[PDB]
């Protein structure tokens, strides 16, 4: 379902072929309960070659 | 099955792989490091020079090295640089011999 | 186009799995259960023996 | 004599037979808390357009967002409900209901 719009200026650009200043986190999945109660499939973004 | 033949004669222990026109050398962490734009590998070696004359009694490595360094020097460096001293030999990790 | 077709095939297999995992009696049992839960304790007292 | 060739084989073998290793990595899937965008191609001119061309040195500054990282703790309770009165062999036809709810402060301090 739809929610809202964003400007191209609202997201940081990984401009140069090398840059080290990114401040990432160790992401922790908050899995939905339906994955266990009714064997539903979890999203994983677009398909890479592997 | 196969046709039999006697064992063939011996050959030089090492073969020339690359002639590098420009190679930078630096000292770090008690070791030498070598690098060039021609090849993406970085060679690492101990600070002590290897005594090539103890093993290359046939001069099969030594003669070829001298000739190559002179060809390269005459082609590109003779008009803009000078030789600092005599050649040096080093055994790099992975089993390579470098003449510098 | 390749990834578009791969996602179309895994949708077809999911529809096949849905058909073989389920069975015709599920609709009947659901229809009966929906009737019995509508009259409380008496509904359960009859529904448990009917099932 | 072959003695020099033989010891050179030994030195070359020892230099490559040495131990070497690298670590393994566990890569947890990203949740979307940090996202980035990429650059795009530009309409390149066919011939020179501009006036007053000149050369120079430059330094580029960007706005300082000053990120602040810290540690936090979450608390919640998962709940599931199903009509088991139909019997374990038939209850699945009636389905399951489920929810996720917050934990009150009293339970966090007095029990957890």
Give a brief rundown of this model:
Chain C: It comes from Human herpesvirus 1 (HHV-1). The structure is cut from a larger assembly and holds four copies of chain A. Chain A has 50 residues and is mostly loops.
Descriptive labels:
little secondary structure, extended, part of a larger assembly, viral protein, 4 chains, 8% helix, Glycoprotein B (chain D), 50 residues
Question: SS-based structural class of chain A?
Answer: little secondary structure
Give the helices and strands of chain A as they follow along the chain.
EH
**How many β-strand stretches of chain A?**
1
**Spatial separation of the terminal alpha carbons of chain A:** 29 Å
Figure out the total of helices of chain A.
Answer: 1
Largest interface: A-D, 20 and 18 residues
Strand percentage of chain A, roughly? under 5%
Shape of chain A: extended
Which oligomeric form is depicted? part of a larger assembly
Indicate the percent of residues in helices of chain A: under 10%
Radius of gyration of chain A: 17 Å
């Amino acid at each position: 379902a739809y929610s809202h719009q964003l400007s191209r200026a609202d997201i940081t650009t990984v401009s140069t072929f090398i840059d080290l200043n990114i401040t990432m986190l160790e992401d922790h999945e908050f899995v939905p309960l339906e994955v266990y109660t009714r064997h539903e499939i979890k999203d994983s973004g677009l398909l890479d070659y592997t | 099955a196969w046709d039999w033949v006697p064992k063939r004669p011996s050959v030089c222990t090492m073969t020339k792989w690359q002639e590098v026109d420009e190679m930078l050398r630096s000292e770090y962490g008690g070791s030498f490091r070598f690098s060039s734009d021609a090849i993406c590998t970085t060679f690492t070696t101990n600070l002590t020079e290897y005594p090539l004359s103890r093993v290359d009694l046939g001069d099969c490595i030594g003669k070829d090295a001298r000739d190559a360094m002179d060809r390269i020097f005459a082609r590109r460096y003779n008009a803009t640089h000078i030789k600092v001293g005599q050649p040096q030999y080093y055994l790099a990790n992975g089993g390579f011999l470098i003449a510098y | 186009e390749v990834q578009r077709r791969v996602q179309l095939h895994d949708l077809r297999f999911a529809d096949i799995d849905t058909v073989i995992h389920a069975d015709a009696n599920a609709a009947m049992f659901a229809g009966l259960g929906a009737f019995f839960e509508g009259m409380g304790d008496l509904g359960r007292a009859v529904g448990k023996v009917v099932m | 004599v072959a003695a020099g060739h033989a010891t050179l084989r030994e030195h070359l073998r020892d230099i490559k037979a040495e131990n070497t290793d690298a670590n393994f990595y566990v890569c947890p899937p990203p949740t979307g808390a940090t996202v980035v965008q990429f650059e795009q191609p530009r309409r390149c001119p066919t011939r020179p357009e501009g006036q007053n061309y000149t050369e120079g040195i430059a330094v580029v500054f960007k706005e300082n967002i000053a990120p602040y990282k810290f540690k936090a703790t979450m608390y919640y309770k998962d709940v599931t409900v199903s009509q088991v009165w139909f019997g374990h062999r038939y209850s699945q036809f009636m389905g399951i209901f489920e929810d996720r709810a917050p934990v009150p402060f009293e339970e966090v301090i007095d029990k957890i």
